[PDB]
Amino acid sequence: STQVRGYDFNRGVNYRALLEAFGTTGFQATNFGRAVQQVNAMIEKKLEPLSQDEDQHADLTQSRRPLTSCTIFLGYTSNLISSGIRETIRYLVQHNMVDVLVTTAGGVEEDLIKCLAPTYLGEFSLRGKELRENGINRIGNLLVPNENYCKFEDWLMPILDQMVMEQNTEGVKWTPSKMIARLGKEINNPESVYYWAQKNHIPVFSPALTDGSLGDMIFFHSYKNPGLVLDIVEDLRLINTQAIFAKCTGMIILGGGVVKHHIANANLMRNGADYAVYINTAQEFDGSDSGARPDEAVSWGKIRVDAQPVKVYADASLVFPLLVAETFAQKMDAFM
Amino acid sequence: EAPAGALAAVLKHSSTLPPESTQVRGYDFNRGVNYRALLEAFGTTGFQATNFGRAVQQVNAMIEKKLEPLSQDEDQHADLTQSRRPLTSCTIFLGYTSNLISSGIRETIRYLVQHNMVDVLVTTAGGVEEDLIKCLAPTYLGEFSLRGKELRENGINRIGNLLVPNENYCKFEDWLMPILDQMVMEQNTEGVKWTPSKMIARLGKEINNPESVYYWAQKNHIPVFSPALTDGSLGDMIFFHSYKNPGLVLDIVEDLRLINTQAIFAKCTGMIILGGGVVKHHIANANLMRNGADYAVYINTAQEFDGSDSGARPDEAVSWGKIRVDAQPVKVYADASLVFPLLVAETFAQKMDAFM
Amino acid sequence: STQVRGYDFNRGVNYRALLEAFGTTGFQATNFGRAVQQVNAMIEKKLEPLSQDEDQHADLTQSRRPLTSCTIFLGYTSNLISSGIRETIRYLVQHNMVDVLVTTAGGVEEDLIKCLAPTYLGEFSLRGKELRENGINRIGNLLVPNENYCKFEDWLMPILDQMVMEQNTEGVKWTPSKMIARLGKEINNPESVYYWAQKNHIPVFSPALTDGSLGDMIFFHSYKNPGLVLDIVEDLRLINTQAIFAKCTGMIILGGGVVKHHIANANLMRNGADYAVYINTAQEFDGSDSGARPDEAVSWGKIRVDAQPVKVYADASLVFPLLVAETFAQKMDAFM
Amino acid sequence: EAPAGALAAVLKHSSTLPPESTQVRGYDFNRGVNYRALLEAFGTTGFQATNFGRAVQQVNAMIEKKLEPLSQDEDQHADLTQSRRPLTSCTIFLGYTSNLISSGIRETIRYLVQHNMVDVLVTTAGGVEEDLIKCLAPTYLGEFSLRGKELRENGINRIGNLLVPNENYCKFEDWLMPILDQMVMEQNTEGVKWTPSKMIARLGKEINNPESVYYWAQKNHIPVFSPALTDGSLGDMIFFHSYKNPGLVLDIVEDLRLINTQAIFAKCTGMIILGGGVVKHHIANANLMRNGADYAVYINTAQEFDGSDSGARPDEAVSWGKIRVDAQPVKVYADASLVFPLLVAETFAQKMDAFM
Numbered sequence A, C: 001s002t003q004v005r006g007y008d009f010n011r012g013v014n015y016r017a018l019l020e021a022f023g024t025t026g027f028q029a030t031n032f033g034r035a036v037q038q039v040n041a042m043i044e045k046k047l048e049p050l051s052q053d054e055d056q057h058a059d060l061t062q063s064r065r066p067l068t069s070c071t072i073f074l075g076y077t078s079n080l081i082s083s084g085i086r087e088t089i090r091y092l093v094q095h096n097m098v099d100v101l102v103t104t105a106g107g108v109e110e111d112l113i114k115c116l117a118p119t120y121l122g123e124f125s126l127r128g129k130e131l132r133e134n135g136i137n138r139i140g141n142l143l144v145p146n147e148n149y150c151k152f153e154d155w156l157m158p159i160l161d162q163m164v165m166e167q168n169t170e171g172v173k174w175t176p177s178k179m180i181a182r183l184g185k186e187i188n189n190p191e192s193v194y195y196w197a198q199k200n201h202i203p204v205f206s207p208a209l210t211d212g213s214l215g216d217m218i219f220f221h222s223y224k225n226p227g228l229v230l231d232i233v234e235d236l237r238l239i240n241t242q243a244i245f246a247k248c249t250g251m252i253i254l255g256g257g258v259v260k261h262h263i264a265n266a267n268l269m270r271n272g273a274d275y276a277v278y279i280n281t282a283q284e285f286d287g288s289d290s291g292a293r294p295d296e297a298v299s300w301g302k303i304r305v306d307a308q309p310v311k312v313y314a315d316a317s318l319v320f321p322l323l324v325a326e327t328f329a330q331k332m333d334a335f336m
Numbered sequence B, D: 001e002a003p004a005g006a007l008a009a010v011l012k013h014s015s016t017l018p019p020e021s022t023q024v025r026g027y028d029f030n031r032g033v034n035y036r037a038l039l040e041a042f043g044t045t046g047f048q049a050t051n052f053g054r055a056v057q058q059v060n061a062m063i064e065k066k067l068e069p070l071s072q073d074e075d076q077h078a079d080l081t082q083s084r085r086p087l088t089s090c091t092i093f094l095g096y097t098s099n100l101i102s103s104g105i106r107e108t109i110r111y112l113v114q115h116n117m118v119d120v121l122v123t124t125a126g127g128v129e130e131d132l133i134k135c136l137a138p139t140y141l142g143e144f145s146l147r148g149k150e151l152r153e154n155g156i157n158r159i160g161n162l163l164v165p166n167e168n169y170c171k172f173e174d175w176l177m178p179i180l181d182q183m184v185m186e187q188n189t190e191g192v193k194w195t196p197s198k199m200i201a202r203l204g205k206e207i208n209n210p211e212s213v214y215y216w217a218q219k220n221h222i223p224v225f226s227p228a229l230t231d232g233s234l235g236d237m238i239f240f241h242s243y244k245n246p247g248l249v250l251d252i253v254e255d256l257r258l259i260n261t262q263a264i265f266a267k268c269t270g271m272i273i274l275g276g277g278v279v280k281h282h283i284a285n286a287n288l289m290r291n292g293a294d295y296a297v298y299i300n301t302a303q304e305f306d307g308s309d310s311g312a313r314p315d316e317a318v319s320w321g322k323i324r325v326d327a328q329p330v331k332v333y334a335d336a337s338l339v340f341p342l343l344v345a346e347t348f349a350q351k352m353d354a355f356m
């Protein structure tokens, strides 16, 4: 039985000790400490060698990504790429710390756009009329000048032209994940999440890739250059296979919506994830999938009965960098 | 004596409010129980009750606009939109998260679609499949607190405070597999290029049951957009089927052209959005293509503080051009299972005669 | 096992049928239906006669309120008196439908002030600087001109003078509940909750009665006329005795904070309430009492183990009038 | 070709933002782990991380103001406030809900009070009693989902995801009863007029344990206001005691005079408010008596939509005069158990040398 006790600042500002004290502080601080433990368990499993029998089975996919003892799925909503958490995610992907990414369309396009032009701090209360008159788009307390999207149009159009040519003359069958890998290769910039993902053979799933600016551009482009097809069925097979042939799986899910369900549903195909951490601000009372507790997913078989999943009820912009500091960043040498 | 600065701060003079200002006043049960008067009184009750009254006004404005007669070239409209649905004076987009189809709000939505009262539906995959499954087997009431281990051991899946037996999905599998066979054959030999909306129309025709939202949608030529249709049980089934019968393709690009042109070629648009996520953004982003919706009502339980699109206020969408600057949008902060049936009672259901 | 099914508007707008369909609609609609059942159970118990043995025990208080078979505690936060729910609460109190009220100071003073001047509709987004320059105070999307409080000052000061005289020359020992009864008698207006409460011998508890405009006025008054004492200890005995000697109890609690805990803690003194409905927008994850589920209160003994309590997760301005329509208002004849 | 109006709506020209505008950028872990730099990066990370950075700035402004030297008549200050606490250049009010004392935030608050870093405390009754009880017996970690029936049968009480055995309250009873006896005797024969703040100071002196917030508060002459002190276990004990030893009176009127005069006679004020309810309103309303606080930070999980005072934004308080129009208040939307220790690390704990 563990006693409640907070960090005592009479000891000085010992930042590691302060963070490690969250576990005994209670409420969501305790859930943060539990999340640190769960992610560290994923990492320690990941670093365990594959036995001969385990290697045989894990090698049954067509994937170029090296085999590990724990396949980690990282999901995040689009707004987290608008935020500075883009840098946190890029770091994990750059160093091969996660194996599959799932995000919505905004979470793809805004990483690419940030290589062309920055996003700025604003305020939630700024009024839409005056912003629109100035072509300034609001994302929470952030601001994206519309010229950012004009730069995206100029950059993306020639790539769409080549994609259509490759589809029609080289037999390429595009899907969202294949498009995202191509966009990461084209942006060719080490600040980009998707640059590192394609370099490191980390697939990115986004079934509704048309829901955002990428969609706007595909739409406009289709009038001049018709017939681009983005198939979602092949991408379903691809994500599900990553779960089916994993030795173990962990889910780190920031936010809700399609990203959260799509990762969890893939893990149902193996009778459940072994480890799971949710960080989101949704609540269960509305019946939403976004707000469902991890234990709802246990009823479906998306999380194993013997797992010890954790949800932190908080804005991931506050929590996720601290979580990374106490988990992946402490094992950086093992990943290089 | 009392400190003068404190008196001055607490007892500061006030300006007179404009004469049009509306007083707060709740329904008086000394009148008895007249439910219409009770609902009308939400407007002057304050907080989200006042927002409910404002939502009633906005939806009624959409409906009144829709019923205004129109004079338009049916052939040009059809070519540019590639739709058989005739244009009206206000195109209404209705969006809802999947869980609302698990709930009894499925019946509320089915009524609106049955009577051709809305023009475009957007929902996530669960919101398609669970309407079909409900024609094969029911969903049951439960509790949020039921533990996952014991539910899983008994083959019961939890959706909030609702419960769906595994056997419901077995029935779905048996029903769907022969249809998927036909869709692959039609793709490979009859040139069909499947998209989510085309699939959803076919599934509605196949279920052939007037309790189904999607049966009525296809009968009335109301398209359904769901760009992540693989995220759910229908996806599971497509996945398993593809190892027995390879080849099915679902394209999302053509469906983007279809939804966006519905907005571009509208005379006026309204958005009624229940919940957040893809459904909310996809409707709003289509309306950016016309420089904004003319009317908008959100009913959702999300909050803005996390930066999410789900929790963004309507005024965020104004900054993008998704809602017109001159619009008067409304958000009700509430579970739609409580509010949406009341909203329909005071809006679409009062105009039943005009829709016939 | 009950099947999910919503109201079918092909039947027409049959408002009673529509409301009764919430029970099978799911999510918070189902909790609303359960709340209707729980409140109706309180009412049916209340209307049951007292046996000889039950009457003997219930009669052991000094209270002038007639005995019933279920003592109903109604609690509400101050903002609900700012809202139109003030009319809903006044109706229940006017017709002797509840037995004990608990509210915070705002929930007392704003009922009295509404007899002097109205509150108006506004918007949540109105900026404070321009409002303050005009002396307009904001309560959510409502507005109270500061002249309303100036009218309160003119009305309340002479009453405070008499209270101090009665304390010093007639031995009166004031407490919040005794002050609230006096203010209700003085306002002498059938639109007032507190007028009806004192007329019907329904006590009102508000231990922090100084936290609001009433406090402002007591504060200013104390410089000219010092020494008014408001004792909270006697009022603790008074509320607790109402629970201890009840045959049965029900709790209807709108909102959180002191109101919710104070009612629940009184009911711990009898080893728990028999019936309980919470309607509030708080969530449990922060460890708050406001956000605690009814089942937390069961661990303390504030709600009986055999009770079937209900929480509706919603703004009470939407839910409470509907709840009253389906419960107390249908039994109005029994209360007159 | 693409519809011209759609192109014009989506590709609208943008104005240039001011040169001072701050770019969004997260901490780069390629630098390694420097926790100070990590916390500093919250300012440019966005959403509530940015609000955290703004809260650090506001609290540091309060502290820097407090440390500015002052020249003031100690005798006049004392008479008008009836307090022995000397005036500083900024009077800081710290408020917290009771559950935060159940949590480990008790240690965070105790540190600030031990070092005389804040001037006025406001908490509800649980926030008083649980600090004292923690000197007699610990609180334990649990889970939110534990069922009430089984906990009650085993004599364990739940506070969120924390657990307190019944025996903790038995120990409290045994400790408190003789003190209540002395308080009644002092009231009836030594003229003591008890109020909540006076009682809390006495309980802190009696507990005589440096782990206690209230021990340090009374040693440093930091008053504690709690106008509903009867709403909790201390109330239970006063209630039971009164049938063995009648007569104890707790007056709230004198405590209103004491807290309000702390605000009226301040040179400058700051408010740091964790949570909502009475604690938030009582601090803010005291500051209306000076026409508003100069600095304010809220950390709470409430939302505005329900009209609640708990969920009101700082800008609502500006409309009342509780926060000055020229102030730059901040709200962080988060559980204070996560955020408050980080805030203290970056503010008060960096100024330890100046406070000694």
Ligand SMILES: NC(=O)c1ccc[n+]([C@@H]2O[C@H](COP(=O)([O-])OP(=O)(O)OC[C@H]3O[C@@H](n4cnc5c(N)ncnc54)[C@H](O)[C@@H]3O)[C@@H](O)[C@H]2O)c1
Pocket (backbone or CB within 6 Å): A076, A077, A078, A079, A080, A082, A104, A105, A106, A107, A110, A139, A208, A211, A212, A213, A254, A255, A256, A257, A258, A259, A279, A280, A281, A282, A283, A290, A314, A315, A316, A317, B276, B277, B278, B281, B282, B302, B306, B307, B308, B309, B310, B311, D047
């Ligand atoms: N920047 C953007 O928001 C953006 C840009 C372009 C397109 N879109 C589109 O909007 C659609 C909806 O977006 P979505 O489903 O990715 O998520 P969303 O932003 O609607 O969020 C879904 C839920 O995730 C949780 N969440 C959100 N932000 C969080 C945070 N900071 N911390 C913790 N939890 C959080 C919340 O409970 C929220 O209700 C997507 O299709 C997307 O492409 C969004």
Ligand SMILES: NC(=O)c1ccc[n+]([C@@H]2O[C@H](COP(=O)([O-])OP(=O)(O)OC[C@H]3O[C@@H](n4cnc5c(N)ncnc54)[C@H](O)[C@@H]3O)[C@@H](O)[C@H]2O)c1
Pocket (backbone or CB within 6 Å): A256, A257, A258, A261, A282, A286, A287, A288, A289, A290, A291, B096, B097, B098, B099, B100, B102, B124, B125, B126, B127, B130, B159, B228, B231, B232, B233, B274, B275, B276, B277, B278, B279, B299, B300, B301, B302, B303, B310, B334, B335, B336, B337, C027
């Ligand atoms: N029954 C199911 O929930 C179900 C079934 C199969 C698949 N899925 C999959 O889960 C994914 C995510 O679902 P989604 O983004 O459609 O929604 P979601 O359930 O994740 O909800 C998104 C947001 O909408 C709002 N919302 C939800 N329920 C609400 C209510 N009752 N009233 C008002 N607002 C409400 C909430 O703020 C929530 O955070 C989808 O891809 C879907 O296909 C869900």
Ligand SMILES: NC(=O)c1ccc[n+]([C@@H]2O[C@H](COP(=O)([O-])OP(=O)(O)OC[C@H]3O[C@@H](n4cnc5c(N)ncnc54)[C@H](O)[C@@H]3O)[C@@H](O)[C@H]2O)c1
Pocket (backbone or CB within 6 Å): B047, C076, C077, C078, C079, C080, C082, C104, C105, C106, C107, C110, C139, C208, C211, C212, C213, C254, C255, C256, C257, C258, C259, C279, C280, C281, C282, C283, C290, C314, C315, C316, C317, D276, D277, D278, D281, D282, D302, D306, D307, D308, D309, D310, D311
């Ligand atoms: N009109 C006012 O708000 C007002 C006026 C004067 C003084 N005050 C003072 O403010 C203090 C704090 O107020 P309080 O504790 O009464 O409550 P509060 O307004 O702080 O609300 C407490 C909690 O109750 C719940 N709640 C609030 N409004 C709700 C609604 N419409 N529906 C459902 N749940 C809701 C919320 O979870 C909230 O966090 C009191 O001491 C009071 O006297 C308030």
Ligand SMILES: NC(=O)c1ccc[n+]([C@@H]2O[C@H](COP(=O)([O-])OP(=O)(O)OC[C@H]3O[C@@H](n4cnc5c(N)ncnc54)[C@H](O)[C@@H]3O)[C@@H](O)[C@H]2O)c1
Pocket (backbone or CB within 6 Å): A027, C256, C257, C258, C261, C282, C286, C287, C288, C289, C290, C291, D096, D097, D098, D099, D100, D102, D124, D125, D126, D127, D130, D159, D228, D231, D232, D233, D274, D275, D276, D277, D278, D279, D299, D300, D301, D302, D303, D310, D334, D335, D336, D337
């Ligand atoms: N441990 C206890 O909670 C406890 C013990 C004994 C008595 N009580 C009694 O319960 C009553 C109500 O308590 P209260 O109004 O002080 O607070 P509360 O716990 O009811 O909280 C009020 C509001 O403050 C905010 N809040 C709560 N916890 C938070 C957190 N961790 N981080 C950020 N914000 C948070 C929330 O919005 C909440 O709705 C008091 O009279 C108290 O004495 C409580």
